């Protein structure tokens, strides 16, 4: 599905992504807006036969399984469908494992050229939280 801001912000809080590894909730929400405009079925297919899936556009060459992606490291140890469900749990659970490598949120392309540097906490304001 597609989430509203607040809905995504709240789904993101219950899941405990506020100030995760130094990342305020605002950052999670912002990366979600320019990565997929909050659609959990969003999918970009790359030249190497690899695809980016879900709300945070997680690449299957590294973190998940789809059945063909090249080296397919599957660092998160998850099937990529788990990332297309409307149940955001798996992309949340993988998100914490990605941010944890010497990359931080720089791992997200939309966050680095769009969110990095701005008052990102603006993304959870006016949400009754």
The residue with tokens 């993101």 is: 12
What gap in Å lies between CA 88 and CA 114, rounded to an integer?
22
Q: Are strands 58-59 and 51-53 parallel, antiparallel or unpaired?
A: antiparallel
Helical (H) or strand (E) element with 28: helix 25-36
Q: What is the DSSP letter of 117?
A: T
Structure method: X-ray
Do 77 and 97 touch, CB atoms closer than 8 A?
no
Domain boundaries along the sequence of the chain: 1-129
- The half-sphere exposure of 101 on its side-chain side, counting CA atoms within 13 A, is 11
Active site residues: 35, 52
What gap in Å lies between CA 3 and CA 73, rounded to an integer?
30
What gap in Å lies between CA 30 and CA 62, rounded to an integer?
23
3-class SS at 64?
Answer: strand
Domain 1-129 adopts which CATH fold? Lysozyme (1.10.530)
Q: DSSP secondary structure string, 68-82?
A: --SS---TT-EEGGG
How many helices (H) and strands (E) the chain has is answered by 4, 5
Q: Is residue 101 a known part of a binding site?
A: yes
């Amino acid at each position: 599905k597609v989430f509203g801001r607040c809905e995504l912000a709240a789904a993101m809080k219950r899941h405990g992504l506020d100030n995760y590894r130094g990342y305020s909730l605002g950052n999670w929400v912002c990366a979600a807006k320019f990565e997929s405009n909050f659609n959990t079925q969003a999918t970009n297919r790359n030249t190497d036969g690899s695809t980016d899936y879900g709300i945070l556009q997680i690449n299957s060459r590294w973190w998940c399984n789809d059945g063909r992606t090249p080296g397919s490291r599957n660092l998160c140890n998850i099937p990529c469908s788990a990332l297309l469900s409307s149940d955001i749990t798996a992309s949340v659970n993988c998100a914490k494992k990605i941010v944890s490598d010497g990359n931080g949120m720089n791992a997200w392309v939309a966050w680095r050229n769009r969110c990095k540097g701005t008052d990102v906490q603006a993304w959870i304001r006016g949400c009754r939280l």
